RNA sequence: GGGUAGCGGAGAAAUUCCAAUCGAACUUGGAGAUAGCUGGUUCUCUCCGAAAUAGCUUUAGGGCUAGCCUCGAGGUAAAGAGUCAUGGAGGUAGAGCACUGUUUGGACUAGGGUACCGAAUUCAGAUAAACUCCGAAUGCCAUGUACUUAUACUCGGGAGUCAGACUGCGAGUGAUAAGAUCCGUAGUCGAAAGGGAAACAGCCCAGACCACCAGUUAAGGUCCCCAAAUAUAUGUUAAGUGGAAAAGGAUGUGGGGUUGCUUAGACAACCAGGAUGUUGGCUUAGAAGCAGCCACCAUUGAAAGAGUGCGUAAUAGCUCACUGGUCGAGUGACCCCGCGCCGAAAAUGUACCGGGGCUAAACAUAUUACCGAAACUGUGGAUGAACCU
RNA sequence: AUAGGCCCAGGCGACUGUUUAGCAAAAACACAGGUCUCUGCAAAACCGUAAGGUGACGUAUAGGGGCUGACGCCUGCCCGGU
RNA sequence: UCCUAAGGUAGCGAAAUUCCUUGUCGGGUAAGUUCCGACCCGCACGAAAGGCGCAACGAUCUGGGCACUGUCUCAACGAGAGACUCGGUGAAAUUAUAGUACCUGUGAAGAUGCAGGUUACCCGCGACAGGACGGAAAGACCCCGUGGAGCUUUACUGCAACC
RNA sequence: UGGGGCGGUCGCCUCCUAAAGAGUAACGGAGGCGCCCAAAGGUUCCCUCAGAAUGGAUGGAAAUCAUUCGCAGAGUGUAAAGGCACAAGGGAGCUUGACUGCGAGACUGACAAGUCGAGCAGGGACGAAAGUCGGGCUUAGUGAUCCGGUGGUUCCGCAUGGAAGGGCCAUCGCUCAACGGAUAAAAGCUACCCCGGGGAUAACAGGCUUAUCUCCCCCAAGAGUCCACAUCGACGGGGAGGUUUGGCACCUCGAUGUCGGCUCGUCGCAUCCUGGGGCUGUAGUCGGUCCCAAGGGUUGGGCUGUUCGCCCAUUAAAGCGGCACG
RNA sequence: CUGGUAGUUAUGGCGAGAAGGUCACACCCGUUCCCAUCCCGAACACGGUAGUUAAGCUUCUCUGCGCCAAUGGUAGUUGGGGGCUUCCCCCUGCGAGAGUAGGUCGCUGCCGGG
């Protein structure tokens, strides 16, 4: 699973996800891509599952791109611990995706199997998506 | 089950202390800083810890020296 | 890759070095690497700290100078031992049971296996609630005559909670067991012989089944897993085999075994060994290129007896006989086979072995199918081994061998010479 | 009948007994001990009117100084407030890769033994509270001769307060939970009645000196309970949606666009045809369009496939694509939008519009009247301050 | 009318006895027995500021204190620390 | 072979002592988390805080059996004393004023009293206890107070006593 | 102090939170300090770094040499931020201003304290001169009062002269670190406990939330003798409920009785039996799954205080939950 | 025409190519003294012009790098109002960053010579 090799600080703020995507709002590498319509956090587990289900249908033919990466980390507390006494220990890694950001790319396959592969990927992500193509 | 943080210093009240165009008495402080964010211009001297004061009575004028620097001056 | 130690004591075992190396292999399987092997030869395990008063210091020093985090012990520890070791070594501890549960919890890729692993882990962690809660029981609010505070004790409340959340999974596993026999209904109604395979990990069971399936199965695309990692196959798979003489039976593969398996997990595999429990021919694939093969074989028999497989025709099949230099394979002695499951002679050899074992009531009997009445020529071609056929003016003459069910099913068509 | 007396006596030992009292008897005195703790504190009207914060504290439910209220008295280069014009300090929102971390895909392997690199160059594309080549809106400081408006400041007498709450916006901790906790900013409650939210301190409108069987409006409303539109014009919904809840599923319904075919006859139906080499080859006991693999032709003809689905173990038989005819007005394929449907389960009794009830008395756009408060106005009274005569 | 239910096996305490008036009758206290130790008589110990007393009108086979608790078999190693 | 003053001897051992634990095997029972006999893996038995046994004794604690029975399956009848009606005498705890319903909701988050509906002629007698967060006792549990008291010691400072 | 205790912390400096002036909290996210330097201070004069490539070397990837490129990619006693190449960085010559008395005026600020300062006088260092120098590129490296010790003094000195003693200036003695320091001097048990208060603050029950828990679904890799969807369904995703383990601390401490059993029940349906039906890997018998359905029914014993659980024997069946865990 | 000496945000710089010169300015020669090198007359210091425009310096050309820079649109946002509230929409005022049309091989002051 995609994790950073090392980080400067182990703890980070939750942040916010308001506004349009700063960059990457268009397809540049492949010819089809999944575009987010809403905004939500995407963990690294959902990136992996949406990728195996995406290359398995393509039978390992053609190249896919991952346009997002889980830079930020989040923490959690055990059950039975009261509030306070510091901060929790990190658990996973997330990538806050604002609306209008392409998350995947497809090239090297015909029209029929490009849309179907993207369709199976979208069902594993918690955001409402749309299949978009280049020009 | 504990935190090793929880330490901070005491704020030093930095920043400007007189405004542009305001008549100022000699010997008064104009700008408290660390290092040299603003250079002393005419009738202005920099102290031991880089506080710009006024040497003569006059009018404070913040003004721009060469492309990437600032200075403060006092004009009678 | 985590850095760990490996500790074990002899305690009157007959397999000390092999079990130690097996623990090393198991640790290497869990993406865990070893940086020290401490072995003590004490007769009886120390009641308080598994190893001993003095050996703890040696373990502590070696782990301190070897940069290791977790220590993996060779046997399950009582809660007092867990607390004492974790408090003296000021690090974490873990036994064989916890390690193998973690291995299974990661290799499980189905709902049944996951539920079984979860129930076994919960049962494992049931005795340690005392030490889990002692720290908060030393400061459990305390006091005295509350006159309004509950009616029980903290430890007993924790036991009630854990038992309440364990019987639910017990009921769910009972329901799952009842479910698993619905898919067996069609096999049960039609009496078809089944050949089930058992053995020790990496003995070649999956490779044997894959070779047979590629040899005879119509759906040759249907294959099985095959890898060198511990516990590659964790779920049983059934395949239907069609020998060229139009004979039918099924062939099933099972998960493998390891030494000193926890008794909690064998209760869970009691279900996964149902297919071998009710079988016709067994094959016990014993490795023949590993010197502790006698130990592994016997361990297989004790595990099978624990499950409840007995009074079953067993055919032993030693594998990997290519590796051994100057050996005659394929061979056959008594009920023992020497072969390698990667060649087109050993496989076919074992096929006629199974043909001898299973089908032995296929007596031959001539038939005279009426010429008009079709649908019987076809039936006596896909369910028999037709020796010769003849054509007459009053019908057709068939000579072949069929099951004793067919001798009475089609008794009238036979004609005596 | 006697002995042991409270800093004491007895105790086969239980903190056991010493006048219904014993981890230290009863009575009087010091004594109105002390209580940063709880309770209580008695007549009326007029004017003004807070705080629940900072600092320190054996300090945290206490106190002291400052902040916030009230009374009195002073001095003017009138110093307070709002807006306007002008001048400034400061790196947030946004954005960006020019530095530092994180990171994707390609060309790229001087040299280690080709990422396994010690790695570096370059192209393209991302990312940041503790990154910045940049950088607003507001806020803040000051000058003015601007226009408007009433406070500021100093000295002195008297206090109370230092448990705050919710709502909108910007953050932290939490799980981007809590009527949670902790800050900044504005409002209301506290200390605020009145009208609307059914009832409902904090939400919306709005600040009660007294009297009136007078009028105009605000939020919210006008079928009945209940004052005022069963109002006007143009459309949507059929779900009681309106009046609860997602991923996902769907020939519900209305409005636009792009298009094929068609009165030299479109779709749908009805009639007829639907074949020859030939059972194509291989594999099979068996493979004739239809167990499986290989090219998938020519022929009659305007049509018929080396056969679209049934069927025979397999032949047989059924059927379709396509063609001709029969009658004669429209039919087939995508995109966008509005309103709707399913997903939809809990415990005393309908019980997720206040009720009745509604197919508008629901929703969208626009327009006009009215009801509606202690608000504002009208009439008559009582009163405080300032300034005048 | 008045007048023992019995039997098998185990833990504790040897037994009769004493105890929390008014929640606990006991496996707790005591006990005959064991052992250590102090005391030569104006004894040690205890009450009292002292005088005066108990011990005792006793004498070491006597008197005060600590632990164990019939009876049977036993009571192991350590004198560095206090 | 390292350290220590020395490294737990005999006798017992899932125990009034075992967390894991309903340890494991055997007995008793149709079925025995308690009981009895064994094993030793004694968290954390052990020799005058005595170790291991032990006839007699016990309103001691524990397990089993015979006899017996309304303890029970499952309750039925009868006697007396209260209760109940009449004559005599005649209190108490409690109490803001009360013409003192149900449901769903609201509210200081659990309403006879608020909102919307549903029910309900006025006054009593014998019974039952769901509510009046029913009565009694300024919660003992918990926390607080620079409150108190009793007890301990290699806490501070002292006194008696003795050398 | 998200009840108290165990754990951790208590004073000072730097950054983020901090919402573009200043200030701004939390048992919020990261680090340092309780010094060092006799030159690591002053002044005058001079110059410039890291790294890389190239050729020769004992000598290697990296030691010293030459050239080229090189706006800081180095350095600045030490942590971070701000700053500095017209040096605040690096060399050399001379020195002790790391001086005495002060100080218009400002910053910060409740107080006690803390910070900057042109300029005047006395007497100097460096420099030809103009001039610079009241420690260090700036911001941490420190604690009052009382009481004692040491040095000085044109102060007082209980009738007078002295003296003892005190005063004034300079300086020394604190892990008073709980760092605005109660005293020169200080640890525990209470289940034998007592008083004044509190729902300002915990244990039962109610309330908000739904991480966890129960149940229901979406996609579909796979299993199921071929066969995703008879029956299951991984890696992932979305909800309903308020029975579990939790979080908060809103009512109750001038008393809301707290487990299990007994008697008595009533309600929900996510149905254990019985009733009707669709699919089936439904030949028959026996079953599996789903839809409608709450009318009635839903056992007696052994072990344990037990809820639960295991076991013996039955039954058409031996349901799951709410009602202050009725 | 040139040698000094200042101001001005690099539109003023970098890089590239050409022309020129003893009247200046430099390159250059030598080390006696003043002075000098952790060694070195390289630099500094001193004494002169045998030689030279190949360097520095002056003039001319550029858009290759750099620098400066609109208009329009967009993000954001004060005030007011709405929602289906991880957030989103409407009216008025302010208004970037990036990208771009475009500009740039400098502009002024004093003194001495030719
Ligand atoms: N030398 C040799 N190697 C063999 C033989 N059979 C199998 N192997 C190898 O050993 C490896 C073990 O795989 P295999 O034994 O099939 O897996 P498995 O035993 O089914 C794993 P599990 O038993 O847990 O299901 C295989 O990769 C195969 O290449 C043999 O006969 N000889
Ligand atoms: Mg600071
Ligand atoms: Mg200085
Ligand atoms: Mg200084
Ligand atoms: Mg510039
Ligand atoms: Mg207690
Ligand atoms: Mg396998
Ligand atoms: Mg006494
Ligand atoms: Mg008593
Ligand atoms: Mg006691
Ligand atoms: Mg007594
Ligand atoms: Mg008494
Ligand atoms: Mg007195
Ligand atoms: Mg007192
Ligand atoms: Mg007023
Ligand atoms: Mg108060
Ligand atoms: Mg005050
Ligand atoms: Mg302005
Ligand atoms: Mg930003
Ligand atoms: Mg005053
Ligand atoms: Mg305060
Ligand atoms: Mg407060
Ligand atoms: Mg507040
Ligand atoms: Mg909130
Ligand atoms: Mg709050
Ligand atoms: Mg609070
Ligand atoms: Mg107000
Ligand atoms: Mg108040
Ligand atoms: Mg009001
Ligand atoms: Mg109101
Ligand atoms: Mg409401
Ligand atoms: Mg009202
Ligand atoms: Mg008023
Ligand atoms: Mg009107
Ligand atoms: Mg009306
Ligand atoms: Mg109902
Ligand atoms: Mg009025
Ligand atoms: Mg009037
Ligand atoms: Mg007895
Ligand atoms: Mg006794
Ligand atoms: Mg007795
Ligand atoms: Mg008693
Ligand atoms: Mg008694
Ligand atoms: Mg005497
Ligand atoms: Mg004793
Ligand atoms: Mg004894
Ligand atoms: Mg000694
Ligand atoms: Mg000695
Ligand atoms: Mg037992
Ligand atoms: Mg016992
Ligand atoms: Mg026993
Ligand atoms: Mg002894
Ligand atoms: Mg003992
Ligand atoms: Mg002893
Ligand atoms: Mg004994
Ligand atoms: Mg006995
Ligand atoms: Mg009677
Ligand atoms: Mg009477
Ligand atoms: Mg409510
Ligand atoms: Mg209610
Ligand atoms: Mg009512
Ligand atoms: Mg009555
Ligand atoms: Mg009441
Ligand atoms: Mg009460
Ligand atoms: Mg009280
Ligand atoms: Mg005391
Ligand atoms: Mg601000
Ligand atoms: Mg600020
Ligand atoms: Mg620290
Ligand atoms: Mg003092
Ligand atoms: Mg004198
Ligand atoms: Mg004198
Ligand atoms: Mg303090
Ligand atoms: Mg009390
Ligand atoms: Mg409260
Ligand atoms: Mg609670
Ligand atoms: Mg309650
Ligand atoms: Mg009360
Ligand atoms: Mg149902
Ligand atoms: Mg049925
Ligand atoms: Mg059925
Ligand atoms: Mg029913
Ligand atoms: Mg019995
Ligand atoms: Mg409950
Ligand atoms: Mg209850
Ligand atoms: Mg000339
Ligand atoms: Mg000379
Ligand atoms: Mg613009
Ligand atoms: Mg711009």
Question: Please, what is the Cα angle at C187 between C181 and C192, to 5 degrees?
Answer: 140
- Is any atom of ligand 1 closer than 6 Å to the C-beta of C254? no
d(CA C202, CA C204): 5
**How many angstroms separate the CA atoms of C393 and C107, rounded?**
66
C210 CA: nearest ligand 1 atom: 16
Contact C266, C307 (CB under 8 A): yes
Beta strands, E only, C132-246: 194-199, 237-243
**Structure tokens of C415?**
């004609």
Determine contact, residues C312/C346, Cβ cutoff 8 Å: no
Alpha carbon distance C299, C296 (integer Å):
5
Q: Is A10 on the interface with B (CB under 8 A)?
A: no
Q: Do A87 and B3 touch (CB under 8 A)?
A: yes
The span from the CA of C132 to the CA of C123, in Å, is: 15
Q: Are strands B44-46 and A129-133 parallel, antiparallel or unpaired?
A: unpaired
Kindly calculate the radius of gyration of chain B based on its CA atoms and give it in whole angstroms.
16
Residues 6+ apart with CB under 8 A from C357: C281, C313, C315
Substitution target from A86, A87, A88 for chain B, most B beta carbons within 10 A: A86
Query: Does ligand 1 lie within 6 Å of residue C346's CB atom?
Result: no
Cβ-proximal residues to C308 (8 Å cutoff; 6+ apart), any chain: C270, C273, C277
Find the Å distance, CA of residue B13 to C1' of nucleotide E67: 77
The answer to whether C365 touches C396, Cβ cutoff 8 Å, is no
Among C73, C92, C78, CA closest to C26 = C73
Tell whether ligand 1 has an atom less than 6 A from the beta carbon of residue C372.
no
Length C411 CA → D369 C1' (Å): 105
Q: How many residues does chain C have?
A: 417
Helices (H), C286-344: 293-307
φ, ψ for residue A86, nearest 5 deg: 100, -155
C259 vs C22: CA distance, rounded Å: 8
Beta strand pairing call for B39-40 and B70-75: parallel
Task: Tell which strand D nucleotides have any atom below 7 Å from a protein Cβ.
Answer: 86-90, 94-97, 101-106, 124-131, 134, 141-143, 171-178, 180, 247-248, 285-286, 312-314
CATH architecture of C3-104: 3-Layer(aba) Sandwich (3.40)
Note if the bond before C330 is cis, omega within 30 degrees. yes
Residue A26 β-bridge partners: none
In Å, how far is A87's CA from the nearest CA of chain B? 8
Alpha-carbon gap, residue C376 to A88, rounded angstroms: 76
Please tell me the distance from the alpha carbon of residue B40 to that of residue B31, in angstroms, as a whole number. Answer: 10
C318: enclosing H helix or E strand: strand C314-319
Separation CA C80–CA C31 (nearest Å):
29
- Tell me the domain boundaries of chain C: 3-104, 168-358
Experimental approach: cryo-EM
Do A131 and A34 form a contact (C-beta atoms < 8 A)?
yes
User: Residue A52 CA to nucleotide G220 C1', Å?
Assistant: 13
Question: How far is the C-alpha of B39 from the C-alpha of B28, rounded, in Å?
Answer: 16
Whole-number Å distance between alpha carbons of A18 and A102: 17
CA atoms of C67 and B6, how far apart (whole Å): 31
- Three-state secondary structure call for residue A128: coil
Question: Measured over all CA atoms, what is the biggest interatomic distance in chain A, rounded to whole angstroms?
Answer: 56
Helix H or strand E segment including C187:
helix C185-189
The span from the CA of C368 to the CA of B38, in Å, is: 118
| Equal fold, C3-104 vs C168-358 | yes
Nearest-CA residue of chain A relative to B3? A86
Asked whether residue A18's C-beta has any atom of DNA/RNA strand H within 7 A, the reply is yes
* β-strand partners of C73: C7
Ligand 1 binding pocket includes C74 (Cβ within 6 Å) = no
How far is it, in rounded angstroms, from Cα C275 to Cα A63? 43
The closest alpha carbon to C233, from C319, C108, C341, belongs to C108
CATH superfamily of C168-358: P-loop containing nucleotide triphosphate hydrolases (3.40.50.300)
> Ligand 1 pocket, C319 CB below 6 A?
yes
Q: Are C201 and C258 a contacting pair, CB within 8 Å?
A: yes
Q: Calculate how close chain B gets to A43, using CA atoms only, in Å.
A: 27
Resolution in A: 3.1
8 A C-beta contact, residue C250 and residue C191: no
Q: Which chain A residue's Cα is nearest to B2?
A: A85
Residue set of the binding site of B for Mg(2+)? 67
Pocket of ligand 1, candidates C26, C29, C197, C206: which has the most ligand atoms within 8 Å of its Cβ, to mutate?
Answer: C206
What is d(CA C59, CA C229) in angstroms, rounded to the nearest whole number? 29
DSSP character for A88?
Answer: P
Q: What residue owns the CA closest to ligand 1's atom 19? A: C202
Q: To the nearest whole angstrom, how far is the Cα of B5 from the nearest Cα of chain A?
A: 9
CB C217 within 8 A of CB C12: no
Question: Is the Cβ atom of A39 within 7 Å of strand H at any atom?
Answer: yes
N-terminal to C-terminal alpha carbon distance within chain C:
78
Q: Which residues contact A22 (CB under 8 A, 6 or more apart)?
A: A98
Q: How many Å from the CA of C52 to C1' of E27?
A: 39
Q: Could you tell me which residues of chain B have a Cβ less than 8 Å from any Cβ in chain A?
A: 1-3
Q: Count Cα neighbours of C250 within 13 Å in the Cβ-side half-sphere.
A: 21
The protein residue whose alpha carbon is closest to atom 32 in ligand 1 is: C320
Identify the bridge partners of residue C314 per DSSP, sorted by sequence position. C282
Q: What distances in angstroms separate CA A2 from CA A34, A36, A49, C31, C137, one per listed residue?
A: 19, 20, 12, 17, 42
Residues B63 and B61: their CA atoms lie apart, in Å, by: 6
């Amino acid at each position: 699973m995609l994790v950073p090799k090392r980080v400067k600080y182990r703890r980070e703020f939750r942040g916010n996800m308001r506004g349009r995507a700063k960059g990457g709002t268009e397809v540049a590498f492949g010819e089809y891509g999944l575009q987010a319509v809403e905004a939500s956090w995407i963990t690294n587990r959902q990136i992996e599952a949406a990728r195996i289900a995406m290359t398995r249908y393509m039978k390992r033919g053609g190249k896919v791109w991952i346009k997002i990466f889980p830079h930020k980390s989040y923490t959690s507390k055990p059950i039975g611990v009261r509030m306070g006494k510091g901060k929790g220990a990190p658990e996973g890694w997330v990538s806050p995706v604002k609306r209008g950001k392409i998350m995947f790319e497809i090239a090297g396959v015909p029209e029929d199997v490009a849309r179907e592969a993207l369709r199976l990927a979208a069902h594993k992500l918690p955001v409402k998506t749309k299949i978009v193509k280049r020009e | 089950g504990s935190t090793s943080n929880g330490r901070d210093s005491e704020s030093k009240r930095l920043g400007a202390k007189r405004a542009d165009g305001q008549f100022v008495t000699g010997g008064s402080i104009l700008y408290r800083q660390r290092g040299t964010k603003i250079y002393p211009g005419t009738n202005v001297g920099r102290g031991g810890d880089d506080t710009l004061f006024a040497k003569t009575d006059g009018v404070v004028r913040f003004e721009r020296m060469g492309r990437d620097k600032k200075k403060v001056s006092v004009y009678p | 890759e985590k850095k760990v130690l490996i500790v074990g004591i002899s305690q009157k075992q007959k397999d000390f070095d092999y079990s130690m190396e097996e623990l090393a292999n198991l640790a290497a399987a869990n993406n865990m690497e070893v940086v020290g092997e401490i072995r003590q030869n004490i007769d009886r395990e120390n009641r308080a700290t598994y190893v001993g008063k003095g050996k703890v210091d040696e373990i502590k020093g070696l782990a301190e100078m070897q940069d290791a985090r977790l220590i993996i012990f060779n046997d399950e520890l009582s809660p007092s031992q867990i607390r004492n070791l974790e408090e003296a070594l000021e690090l974490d501890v873990m036994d064989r049971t916890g390690l193998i549960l973690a291995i299974f919890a990661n290799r499980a890729k189905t709902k049944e296996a996951q539920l079984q692993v979860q129930i076994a882990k919960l049962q494992y962690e049931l005795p340690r609630i005392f030490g889990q809660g002692e720290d908060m029981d030393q400061q459990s609010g305390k006091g005295g005559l509350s006159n309004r505070g509950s009616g029980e004790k903290k430890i007993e409340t924790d036991r009630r909670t854990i038992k309440h959340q364990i019987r639910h999974l017990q009921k769910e596993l009972d329901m799952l067991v009842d479910d698993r026999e619905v898919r067996r209904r069609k096999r049960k109604k039609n009496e078809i012989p089944v050949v089930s395979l058992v053995g020790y990990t990496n003995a070649g069971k999956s490779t044997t089944m894959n070779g047979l399936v590629r040899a005879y199965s119509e759906t040759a695309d249907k294959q099985v897993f095959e890898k060198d990692m511990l516990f590659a196959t964790l779920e049983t798979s059934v395949r239907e085999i069609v020998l060229p003489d139009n004979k039918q039976f099924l062939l099933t593969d099972t998960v493998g075994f390891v030494s000193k398996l926890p008794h909690q997990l064998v209760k869970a595999f009691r279900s996964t060994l149902e297919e071998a429990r009710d079988a016709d021919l067994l094959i016990h694939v014993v490795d023949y290129s590993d010197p502790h093969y006698k130990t592994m074989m016997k361990t297989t028999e004790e595990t099978l007896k624990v499950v409840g497989v007995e009074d079953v025709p067993v055919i032993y099949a030693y594998n990997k006989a290519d590796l051994l230099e100057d050996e005659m394979y394929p061979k056959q002695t008594g009920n023992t086979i020497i072969f390698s499951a990667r060649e087109e002679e050993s496989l076919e050899f074992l096929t006629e072995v199974i043909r001898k074992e299973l089908f032995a009531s296929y007596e031959k009997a001539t038939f005279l199918i009426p010429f008009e009445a079709g649908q019987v020529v076809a039936y006596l071609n896909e369910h028999a081994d037709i020796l010769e056929t003849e054509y007459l003016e009053n019908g057709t003459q068939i000579v072949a061998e069929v099951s004793p069910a067919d001798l009475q099913k089609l008794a009238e068509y036979q004609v005596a010479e």
